[PDB]
């Protein structure tokens, strides 16, 4: 097979996004015949240079996930990616740890296939334009740049939350993400710091292409704003050296291969 073209000729641009209708994954699976068990897909007519693992931090967000799958699967295939979907389900009912789950995703997906690109996406963010590439670039990529909840612009210029993409080398260079941001807030800013402290800069599509929708939702219990976040982001340069991939442990409790995604249920513990 020849290499796929540099830019996909299948993209249609702006799309209409809605979250007020029910979603039936069995139907979605039928609508997406070429997506194999575990939510895997690669174009059959050409070889994609983008071997992407999409990592979603998760717990009790099945409804949002259904919307995510319904909308992203068609987009990822049009982008001609060799990809896999991984939902990292946090076992238990103790304080949520978004970034630690993301690290588990990176490590576990690598055991599946030689992925060289990682897209980290919150479960409730849907891209509105398929020209917003869900793959890696020469520099870390911020994808959800113009979310409706922020007035279709960045909340601040160093904002790196929501959806982003790091190549395997970029991720390894920053020792992955921090493992000690329990509860809401700051871990995305810590990650931004790690990238800068390792000589990188943020790459972003323009504001129109980067338009993204956030599914309105209320506060989840067990992910209360972390009071130590402001203090933690002030010391990233020092703490990233020993807190991240090189200090990670967890226990996978179960791996489920669903038609549209692989769900890894994992015990990431509590604060130490
Ligand atoms: C640490 C934290 O809670 N981060 C969350 C972030 O919070 C906002 C962020 O603002 C940074 C910018 O604030 C401007 O006023 C100006 O100073 C800019 O130079 C600066 O970069 O941090 C402040 C406190 O540091 C916080 O009060 C703001 O709300 O918001 C995003 C979006 O919700 C979170 O993803 C992030 O974790
Ligand atoms: N008035 C509405 C206030 C809602 C404020 C709640 C904070 O909202 P956001 O900043 O969107 O963060 P969030 O959506 O709660 O967390 C981000 C991401 O973590 C994941 N997440 C978080 C908490 C939880 O219980 N389960 C889960 O899966 C999910 O992928 C989510 O999209
Ligand atoms: Mn949200």
């Amino acid at each position: 097979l020849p290499a796929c073209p540099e830019e996909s000729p299948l993209l249609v641009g702006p799309m209409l996004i809605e979250f007020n209708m029910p979603v039936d994954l069995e139907l979605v699976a039928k609508q997406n015949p070429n997506v194999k068990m575990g939510g895997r897909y690669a174009p059959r007519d050409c070889v994609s240079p983008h071997k992407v693992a999409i990592i979603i931090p998760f717990r009790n967000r099945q409804e949002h996930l259904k919307y995510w799958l319904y909308y992203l699967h068609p987009v990822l295939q049009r982008q001609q990616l060799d990809y896999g979907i991984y939902v990292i389900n946090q076992a238990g009912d103790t304080i949520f740890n978004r970034a630690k789950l993301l690290n588990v995703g990176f490590q576990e997906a690598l055991k599946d296939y030689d992925y060289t690109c990682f897209v980290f996406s919150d479960v409730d963010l849907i891209p509105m334009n398929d020209h917003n590439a869900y793959r890696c670039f020469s520099q870390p990529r911020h994808i959800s740049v113009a979310m409706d909840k922020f007035g279709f612009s960045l909340p601040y210029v160093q904002y790196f939350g929501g959806v982003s993409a790091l190549s395997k080398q970029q991720f390894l260079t920053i020792n992955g993400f921090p493992n000690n941001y329990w509860g809401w807030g700051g871990e995305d800013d810590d990650i931004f710091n790690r990238l800068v402290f390792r000589g990188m800069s943020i790459s972003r599509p323009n504001a129109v292409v980067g338009t993204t929708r956030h599914i309105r939702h209320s506060r989840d219990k067990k992910n209360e704003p972390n009071p130590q976040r402001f203090d933690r982001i002030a010391h990233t340069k020092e703490t990233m050296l020993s807190d991240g991939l090189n200090s990670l442990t967890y226990q996978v409790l179960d791996v489920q291969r669903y038609p549209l995604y692989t769900q890894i249920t994992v015990d990431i513990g509590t604060p130490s």
Side-chain angles (χ1 to χ4, degrees):
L1 292 180
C4 293
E6 187 175 310
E7 178 166 12
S8 173
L10 310 176
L11 313 172
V12 297
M15 306 169 289
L16 308 173
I17 308 302
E18 282 212 306
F19 309 119
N20 60 349
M21 78 292 181
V23 181
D24 175 358
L25 293 191
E26 294 201 304
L27 208 208
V28 178
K30 293 171 183 173
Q31 285 165 41
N32 288 278
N34 305 110
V35 170
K36 287 104 68 181
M37 191 59 50
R40 284 285 287 286
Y41 171 91
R44 90 168 65 201
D45 304 303
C46 58
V47 182
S48 176
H50 309 300
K51 285 149 63 195
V52 195
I54 305 178
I55 314 301
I56 303 175
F58 178 107
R59 186 169 66 196
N60 198 194
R61 286 294 192 90
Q62 195 58 26
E63 196 179 82
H64 288 177
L65 176 58
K66 296 171 63 178
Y67 281 117
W68 194 92
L69 296 168
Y70 172 72
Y71 285 113
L72 274 303
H73 269 301
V75 174
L76 304 170
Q77 293 171 79
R78 285 203 295 283
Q79 292 189 356
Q80 301 188 307
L81 311 171
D82 174 357
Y83 73 92
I85 307 304
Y86 297 81
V87 172
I88 314 305
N89 181 42
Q90 184 172 321
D93 299 286
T94 51
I95 195 169
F96 199 69
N97 194 322
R98 180 179 185 279
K100 192 168 175 187
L101 295 166
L102 297 183
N103 280 335
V104 171
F106 169 86
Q107 278 212 345
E108 293 296 305
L110 279 178
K111 291 176 183 173
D112 263 8
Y113 184 64
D114 174 39
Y115 296 106
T116 55
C117 175
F118 299 77
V119 171
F120 301 95
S121 179
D122 283 351
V123 77
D124 50 24
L125 294 173
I126 311 295
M128 304 186 75
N129 192 311
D130 66 11
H131 280 286
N132 191 1
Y134 269 52
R135 51 82 173 185
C136 298
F137 294 70
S138 63
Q139 288 294 317
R141 183 78 165 186
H142 182 39
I143 295 171
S144 61
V145 307
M147 292 170 35
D148 53 7
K149 76 171 181 182
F150 292 135
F152 307 97
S153 65
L154 289 169
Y156 47 108
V157 297
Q158 299 181 345
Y159 174 69
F160 192 59
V163 190
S164 71
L166 281 74
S167 70
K168 186 180 182 178
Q169 194 47 57
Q170 284 156 11
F171 192 82
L172 289 179
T173 296
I174 60 173
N175 187 34
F177 303 157
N179 293 312
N180 57 351
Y181 282 76
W182 302 91
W184 187 95
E187 92 291 347
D188 49 332
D189 290 324
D190 182 278
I191 293 164
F192 170 83
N193 293 344
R194 291 183 180 223
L195 298 166
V196 172
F197 290 142
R198 286 292 175 283
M200 293 174 268
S201 61
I202 315 303
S203 171
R204 295 189 169 96
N206 66 58
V208 174
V209 167
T211 290
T212 299
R213 285 210 60 187
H214 177 259
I215 302 170
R216 302 186 67 173
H217 65 81
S218 51
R219 301 171 181 293
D220 299 285
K221 317 298 177 183
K222 300 302 177 183
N223 191 44
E224 309 285 350
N226 177 14
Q228 319 175 305
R229 64 185 189 287
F230 309 101
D231 207 282
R232 287 194 192 291
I233 60 176
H235 298 92
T236 305
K237 190 176 187 181
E238 309 110 81
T239 59
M240 73 187 280
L241 288 175
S242 61
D243 190 306
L245 283 185
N246 69 358
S247 76
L248 174 76
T249 70
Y250 54 83
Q251 180 59 205
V252 169
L253 302 189
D254 182 44
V255 177
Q256 292 293 309
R257 302 293 179 171
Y258 291 118
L260 302 170
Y261 66 103
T262 288
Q263 175 170 290
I264 298 174
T265 298
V266 61
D267 178 345
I268 55 155
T270 60
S272 74

